[PDB]
Amino acid sequence: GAGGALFVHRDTPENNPDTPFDFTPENYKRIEAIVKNYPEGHKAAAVLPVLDLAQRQNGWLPISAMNKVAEILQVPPMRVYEVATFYTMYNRKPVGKYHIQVCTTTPCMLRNSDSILEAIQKKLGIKVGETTPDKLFTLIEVECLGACVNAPMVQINDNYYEDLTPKDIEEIIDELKAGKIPKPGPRSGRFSCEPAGGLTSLTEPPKGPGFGVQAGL
């Protein structure tokens, strides 16, 4: 589908260069640590980590934060604009407290991700582009979060919830809005990508060090 969000910034009272943003001293220490991970003369390599840290501190990315990152890294603001508008994990508009991302790619689609999307829709009463009136949940559609084996799966604030049934995701939503912390992972009684059939492989105890080592080493 066509991307709803625009790629031109128009100043608003909520979002304009005079919007107050700054990094906390702990965040400045983290920025120093991040910058020391690249060779001298290549400070611009830290644009993505520092921008992500700004988003993690603020929740989203106002243009003031992007200008601040450009100023800290001595990078022209247009390059930071390019980075922020290229990568989809950056939020250039405010999002809810829990950003719900449902994978609808073909491997997840085959395992009825439509049921999960509809269950979330009828539990929250919002669409796949809206935010709840209490500003708690934002629901969007994403592409292949990397857990195709555990389809259908959903990501909520860098946490994975997979092997989902509509009732399971509704319960997760209830305990999320109740202030609890839901345990990330599959909900079907399997811990990880192992087969649910009974662990067809890797049954024997793992071999000790140097077991298969060749001679002359």
Partner 1 sequence: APKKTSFGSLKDEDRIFTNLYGRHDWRLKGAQSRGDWYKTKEILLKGPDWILGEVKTSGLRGRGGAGFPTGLKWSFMNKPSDGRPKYLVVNADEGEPGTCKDREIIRHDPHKLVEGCLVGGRAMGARAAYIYIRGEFYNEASNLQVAIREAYEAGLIGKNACGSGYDFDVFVVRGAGAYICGEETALIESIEGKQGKPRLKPPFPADVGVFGCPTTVANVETVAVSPTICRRGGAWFASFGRERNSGTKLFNISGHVNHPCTVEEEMSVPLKELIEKHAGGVIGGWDNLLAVIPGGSSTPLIPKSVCETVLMDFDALVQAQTGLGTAAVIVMDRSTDIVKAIARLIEFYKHESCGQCTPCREGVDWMNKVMARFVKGDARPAEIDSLWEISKQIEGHTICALGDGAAWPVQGLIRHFRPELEERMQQFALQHQ
Partner 2 sequence: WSSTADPLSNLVLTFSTKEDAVAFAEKNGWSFDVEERKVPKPKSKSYGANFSWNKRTRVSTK
Binding site members for [2Fe-2S] cluster: 103, 108, 144-148
Q: With beta carbons less than 8 A apart as the criterion, state whether 119 and 161 touch.
A: no
CB of 36 to ligand FES, least distance (A): 34
Nearest residue to 64 via CA among 12, 22, 96: 22
Q: Is 146 in the site for ligand FES (CB under 6 A)?
A: yes
- CA atoms of 48 and 90, how far apart (whole Å): 10
CB of 100 to partner 1, least distance (A): 14
DSSP letters of 2-25?
Answer: ---S-S-----SSSSTTS-----H
Give whichever of 78 and 178 is closer to partner 2, judged by the CB atom. 78
In angstroms, the Cα distances linking 213 to 12, 206, 207, 216 are: 66, 15, 11, 9
Q: Is 146 in the site for partner 2 (CB under 8 A)?
A: no
Q: What strands, in cross-sheet order, belong to the sheet with 154-156? A: 137-142, 98-103, 154-156, 160-162, 185-186
CB of 71 to partner 1, least distance (A): 15
Q: With beta carbons less than 8 A apart as the criterion, state whether 61 and 90 touch.
A: yes
Q: Is 98 in the site for partner 1 (CB under 8 A)?
A: no
Interface region with partner 1, contact rule CB under 8 A, candidates 5-13, 46-54, 115-123, 129-137: 46-54
Residues that bind partner 2 (CB under 8 A): 41, 44, 75-76, 78-79, 82
| Interacting residues toward partner 1 by CB under 8 A | 1, 3, 37-39, 42, 44-49, 51-52, 73, 75, 79, 82-83, 86-90, 104-107, 109-111, 142-151, 155, 158-160, 184, 191-197, 199-204, 206-214, 217
